[PDB]
Amino acid sequence: MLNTCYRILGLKPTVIFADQIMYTGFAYAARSGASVGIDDMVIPEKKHEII
Amino acid sequence: SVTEFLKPRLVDIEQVSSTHAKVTLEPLERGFGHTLGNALRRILLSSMPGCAVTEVEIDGVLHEYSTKEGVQEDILEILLNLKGLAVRVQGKDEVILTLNKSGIGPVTAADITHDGDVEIVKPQHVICHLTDENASISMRIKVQRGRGYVPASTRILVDACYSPVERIAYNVEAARVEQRTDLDKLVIEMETNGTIDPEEAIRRAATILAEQLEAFVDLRDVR
Amino acid sequence: VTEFLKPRLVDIEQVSSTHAKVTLEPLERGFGHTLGNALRRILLSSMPGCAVTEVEIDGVLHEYSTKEGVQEDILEILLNLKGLAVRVQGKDEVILTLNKSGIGPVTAADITHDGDVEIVKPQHVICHLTDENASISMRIKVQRGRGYVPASTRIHSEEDERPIGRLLVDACYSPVERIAYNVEAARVEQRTDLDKLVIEMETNGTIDPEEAIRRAATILAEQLEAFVDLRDVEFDPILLRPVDDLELTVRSANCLKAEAIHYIGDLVQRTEVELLKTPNLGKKSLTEIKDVLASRGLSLGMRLENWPP
Amino acid sequence: GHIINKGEAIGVIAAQSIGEPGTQLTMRESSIQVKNKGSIKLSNVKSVVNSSGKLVITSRNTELKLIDEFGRTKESYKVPYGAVLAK
Amino acid sequence: ARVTVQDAVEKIGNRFDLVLVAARRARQMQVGGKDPLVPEENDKTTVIALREIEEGLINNQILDVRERQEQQEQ
Amino acid sequence: LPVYQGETTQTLQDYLMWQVELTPFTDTDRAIATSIVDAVDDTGYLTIQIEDIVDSIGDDEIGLEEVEAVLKRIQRFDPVGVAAKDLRDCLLIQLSQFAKETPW
Amino acid sequence: EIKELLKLGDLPTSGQIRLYDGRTGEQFERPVTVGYMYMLKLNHLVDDKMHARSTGSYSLVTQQPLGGKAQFGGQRFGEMEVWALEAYGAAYTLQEMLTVKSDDVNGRTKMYKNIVDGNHQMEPGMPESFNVLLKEIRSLGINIELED
Amino acid sequence: KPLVGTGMERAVAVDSGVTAVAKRGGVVQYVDASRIVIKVNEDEMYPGEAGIDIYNLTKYTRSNQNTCINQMPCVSLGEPVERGDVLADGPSTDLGELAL
Amino acid sequence: SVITVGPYLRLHQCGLPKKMALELFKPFIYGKLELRGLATTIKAAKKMVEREEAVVWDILDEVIREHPVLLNRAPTLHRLGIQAFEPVLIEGKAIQLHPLVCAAYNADFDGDQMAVHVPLTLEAQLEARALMMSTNNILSPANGEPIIVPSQDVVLGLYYMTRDCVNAKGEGMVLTGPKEAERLYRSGLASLHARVKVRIT
Amino acid sequence: RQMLRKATIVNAGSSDFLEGEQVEYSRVKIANRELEANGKVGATYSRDLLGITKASLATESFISAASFQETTRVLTEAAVAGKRDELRGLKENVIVGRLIPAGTGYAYHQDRMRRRAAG
């Protein structure tokens, strides 16, 4: 997306685009939470049989 | 010092058009920037008086999967265009409107019958697409009074966009008064659908918040 | 508006001496969350409290040493005094005394009590002593503030003051330090379903819940009063003395008056090659004037940007 | 987005981008599999008489190439002189 | 402040003579005797000279012509 | 290590010239100035007579009044009244500087 | 066992918990797992790392400034750095880094004067280190000089 | 003190010789911010001595790393302390446990 | 100079701490004090700067405003090891580097140190603005791919906000496009809402 | 390319009865000798590549290619042969402290080179 924006539009457009994309990403990565935990990853039950 | 707070004196507002305006403030107190921005945004977005269209009754089948029969456009796009109409009622209650035009093709807001208190901000807004022949059509729309926003799934047919706003956002920057740089500078950006000045809408929302909060101080600051 | 039915205050509850729960009247939809959030942020951002500012003691000199007869060091004494909760009256900047001897526990009750100072928790610890011949005697200065202020902020205010023996501490000026809110749906039938917000706070005992809520609401009102009316769309050179007392020998005053020379600055921001364009005064008089001008301005060295009237 | 102008030092641009990715490592004739449809393209292989119904090879420089629809090739598959043409 | 410098590059092309022209213009603008043909906006001589060049009024020819005219007018 | 530390230092006379450089003046004023502050002690009063300095210039144009000027310009530099030419007046210069408000 | 221990203190066995925003008062989705980690502060603090300089004392040999914060020193420029500079084609910046901020004695004072006066003009001259190298080469039986 | 440990911190703290422990002691008589005295019982006491042990703490002394090595006491007044029990708490220690 | 994260402070900017500032530009502060008639002597300007008056900070903000600076990582392998940015005063002791530029500098926000350089001559400032600015080194000088490419939390946030489990709240909802944020912020639908019809221009 | 220089010759070609001639130098020499005056005198050359650590030292300027590997041997060879640097390389101008002939200083360098023709 950024490469095509640079190619088609120009330098200033792709720069301001990258800036707005980074702003929106910083906002949504904090509004979404994106947590981690033990039960997040799942161990397959078939592993005990394959071993 | 003890109870002295900083009040914004720089309220310069620059606007590009009559519906878009970017307002900025001066360095405020610590933590008040985001609080005030969120409060004002939620007040002006979740509950705001204004008029809007609620439902239409077009001649044909009440179901959505209808036919064109000369309209050349699906009724879904017709309702989508009808949502983008800022009708203003001076004092009257829920009222009915209708329209009738020839087969020229350009269907605008001027085709609706003119009433006493019913007004349209832009008479060039598209209501129906380009017709194919001289066939006419009746809209039979109605408008109601309300505040805020509520979809048509729960409260019936097209939608209920009583809020006379289009988009609202707020940002907070760092600023210094004389030496300390831990001051907040609020920047509001609100695109309005029409019929209400952005600064006027901000003033109305602030007055609404004040009159909703003034009962908590129990008549403070008498003198 | 359409009958926004603004809420009211009612049913103020007091769970304990430092934990309370306040309730309001039902309000319109979409108001409880924002109201609770704004009230919490204001109560946690700027609320007037009372803390300790500076402590003096005859026994010890600095805070990096100990005292014969005490168990805990001076730093622990200061950290315990920082957490001391006490409310004060109309006048601010108060100073109390604490003197006690023995081996028993020294608490906040055995302090000289004045009519304008009230302790809310006399069971605090002041680093009790261990020896019999030990006797502590100090003075605690209690002031009031609004926000957290460290010890480095109040250094510039004391340059000739603060002798050897007085140790300053950190002040918090925040008596709540913890609060929460919750919105639910109750107490309204004859009309549409409304919502009520309850606020559970845990203060330190210095300030009252109702008073704090009223203060927060008044601050919010005063702050929002500025958005109701949207509008609005010294430095000078020190050397400004007049042209007098410049020792105009013969014709220097006449040349200054004829050329409409200003007081001081305009004559300084001139070069000799450009000064020779003036009526002939002579090299001797030029050097005589340049000496007097250099005695105060380093040989006419200056290039001013602007000139205020 | 334009051609390089005069005065720029290519030698400084070069010899710096090659050694920049310093993420390398340290301390250390019968099986023929074709991908798609192709041709032989012996590329000047000396053809000699063979025992079976094929052609023998005497040159040491042999290189094949597969042609599906155009001049584009798929692989080389260099074989020794002891190769026997099966097709 | 000026974010991106592309118009002056298109006016020069060589990407190297632009710096020399902007420097020889800003030197004069800072030392005095010249007046910015572009209305300033509380900016230093460097960005002013660069924007005047990107606007299409200052280059390696007009400056030399003006210097020769000023030297011959003495 | 070849230069070890070799920290070149201030030196007073060296300090006097650093402000000579950013004082504004002409070539003749900068020439006399180098002459004057050339001839100045660790204590700070000047070694040679002022009429001597005129003989060091060797210029008909140069005059005592001109010298009185460049000298006094650099006479209140850093620190206060330095290049004294026989203390009495050095004291008088430091008096000179501070406010009327102090008694006596 | 960890999950069973979370049940005795009235806590969720999964370990997740809902959190609100301290600036918008909105509930976050995807509940964030909170905990209590043992944190330790390192000696690498910012109070000693920072070091600035504009003009200080130089050395007698090669006339270079002191260096790594030793009595108000300054940082060092590198070979990879001048290579990177030449990659940009900044000849004037390089000359400034070679004469202005360097051992050039007859240039530092002049640059200071031009900056205080607001001239912004550079006079390169010649570094003293080249003269030191010439003298050290002439100290042996090898003649060396510069022509015109 | 840490909430998630291994148990080895106790041994690391008592073995590092960074604190002050009670050797051949039976009971404490006087406690001070920089002085500790212990009256040994007659069980572990041999004749020819008064029968008291003294420990002088280290208060705010410069270390090699320009840090501060300060010892805090544990007992308050008249506490029966056995042999091999800690008395003071060195830098980053809590009740004989390594806590940094 | 110590590196920190610049969430704000967009590409053509860098956070220069005011404690490290007012020292590098001291020869410019002296000049600005002599020009504005705030110090008749050099000694007076030095005394006013060593005391850190408010006018000193004002002059500093006025002069450093239109004056670029350049940063350089100590391990520099390629051309992008030295870049130029606009200095902005931050009340701290660590320079804030832009996240997207961190890819070029190869920093990882651990214990690191950054070198700063101030240009005095006009030609050096022009070379830093026209050649060494971050707003010009988009593509790489080795292969051609763009250097500025998001890989961090931004990518995860975009991937999360552009998704749909099966159908979130308000599936059948139809809008114009500017109403999406309006219905997401207050109530009506979530970001994971699918089958939403909108007119894109 | 940088590795491909210093081509040896087998035929005289009236250029030099020696070994160790650069490719560009020999090419300019043969282009100035053959087409101008005598084309029958052809100088056949053999381009033998050298390693980086070996081709680096093969420079006409004694200033450069000194700090790279060894300084003493290069200095002795330059003192024995008596060669001039003329400051053509980047490192030469770097050590001397002038504008390098690259980037913004390339115009200044070209002007200085053009000015050295007349005087």
UniProtKB/Swiss-Prot annotation, chain C:
GO terms for biological process: bacterial-type flagellum assembly; bacterial-type flagellum-dependent cell motility; cell motility; cellular response to cell envelope stress; DNA-templated transcription initiation; intracellular iron ion homeostasis; nitrate assimilation; regulation of DNA-templated transcription elongation. Residues 235-309 are annotated as: Alpha C-terminal domain (alpha-CTD). Pfam families: RNA_pol_A_bac, RNA_pol_A_CTD, RNA_pol_L. InterPro entries: DNA-dir_RNA_pol_insert (IPR011262), DNA-dir_RNA_pol_RpoA/D/Rpb3 (IPR011263), DNA-dir_RpoA (IPR011773), RBP11-like (IPR036603), RNAP_asu_C (IPR011260), RNApol_insert_sf (IPR036643). GO terms for cellular component: cytoplasm; cytosol; cytosolic DNA-directed RNA polymerase complex; membrane; transcription elongation factor complex. Acetylated on Lys-283 and Lys-284 in the presence of glucose. PatZ controls acetylation of Lys-284 but not of Lys-283. (Microbial infection) ADP-ribosylated on both alpha subunits by the phage T4 protein ModA. ADP-ribosylated on only one of the alpha subunits by the phage T4 protein Alt. Gene3D superfamilies: 5' to 3' exonuclease, C-terminal subdomain (1.10.150.20), DNA-directed RNA polymerase, insert domain (2.170.120.12), RNA polymerase, RBP11-like subunit (3.30.1360.10). The modification N6-acetyllysine is found at K283, K284. It catalyses: RNA(n) + a ribonucleoside 5'-triphosphate = RNA(n+1) + diphosphate. One of its GO terms (molecular function) is DNA binding. It is an enzyme of class 2 (transferase). Residues 1-231 are annotated as: Alpha N-terminal domain (alpha-NTD). The modification ADP-ribosylarginine is found at R251. Belongs to the RNA polymerase alpha chain family.
Curated annotation (Swiss-Prot), chain D:
Acetylated on several lysine residues in the presence of glucose. It comes from the Bacteria. The modification N6-acetyllysine is found at K65. Co-administration of salinamide and rifampicin or salinamide and myxopyronin suppresses the emergence of resistance to both antibiotics. DNA-dependent RNA polymerase (RNAP) catalyzes the transcription of DNA into RNA using the four ribonucleoside triphosphates as substrates. Resistance to the antibiotics salinamide A, salinamide B, rifampicin, streptolydigin, CBR703, myxopyronin, and lipiarmycin can result from mutations in this protein. Belongs to the RNA polymerase beta' chain family. The RNAP catalytic core consists of 2 alpha, 1 beta, 1 beta' and 1 omega subunit. When a sigma factor is associated with the core the holoenzyme is formed, which can initiate transcription. The rRNA transcription and antitermination complex (rrnTAC) consists of RNAP, NusA, NusB, NusE (rpsJ), NusG, SubB, ribosomal protein S4, DNA and precursor rRNA; S4 is more flexible than other subunits. This is DNA-directed RNA polymerase subunit beta'. It comes from Escherichia coli (strain K12). The chain holds residues 906 to 1005 of 1407 of the full protein.
Swiss-Prot record, chain E:
GO terms for molecular function: bacterial-type RNA polymerase core enzyme binding; DNA binding; DNA-directed RNA polymerase activity. The RNAP catalytic core consists of 2 alpha, 1 beta, 1 beta' and 1 omega subunit. When a sigma factor is associated with the core the holoenzyme is formed, which can initiate transcription. The rRNA transcription and antitermination complex (rrnTAC) consists of RNAP, NusA, NusB, NusE (rpsJ), NusG, SubB, ribosomal protein S4, DNA and precursor rRNA; S4 is more flexible than other subunits. This is DNA-directed RNA polymerase subunit omega. Keywords: DNA-directed RNA polymerase, Nucleotidyltransferase, Transcription, Transferase. Its EC number is 2.7.7.6. GO terms for cellular component: cytosol; cytosolic DNA-directed RNA polymerase complex; RNA polymerase complex; transcription elongation factor complex. Belongs to the RNA polymerase subunit omega family. It is an enzyme of class 2 (transferase). It catalyses: RNA(n) + a ribonucleoside 5'-triphosphate = RNA(n+1) + diphosphate. GO terms for biological process: bacterial-type flagellum assembly; bacterial-type flagellum-dependent cell motility; cell motility; cellular response to cell envelope stress; DNA-templated transcription initiation; intracellular iron ion homeostasis; nitrate assimilation; protein-containing complex assembly. The gene is rpoZ. Transmembrane segments: none annotated.
Swiss-Prot record, chain H:
The RNAP catalytic core consists of 2 alpha, 1 beta, 1 beta' and 1 omega subunit. When a sigma factor is associated with the core the holoenzyme is formed, which can initiate transcription. The rRNA transcription and antitermination complex (rrnTAC) consists of RNAP, NusA, NusB, NusE (rpsJ), NusG, SubB, ribosomal protein S4, DNA and precursor rRNA; S4 is more flexible than other subunits. In pull-down experiments interacts with CedA. (Microbial infection) Interacts (via flap domain) with Escherichia phage lambda antitermination protein Q; this interaction renders bacterial RNAP resistant to transcription pausing and allows it to read through termination signals. Co-administration of salinamide and rifampicin or salinamide and myxopyronin suppresses the emergence of resistance to both antibiotics. It comes from the Bacteria. Belongs to the RNA polymerase beta chain family. Acetylated on several lysine residues in the presence of glucose. The chain holds residues 697 to 796 of 1342 of the full protein. This is DNA-directed RNA polymerase subunit beta.
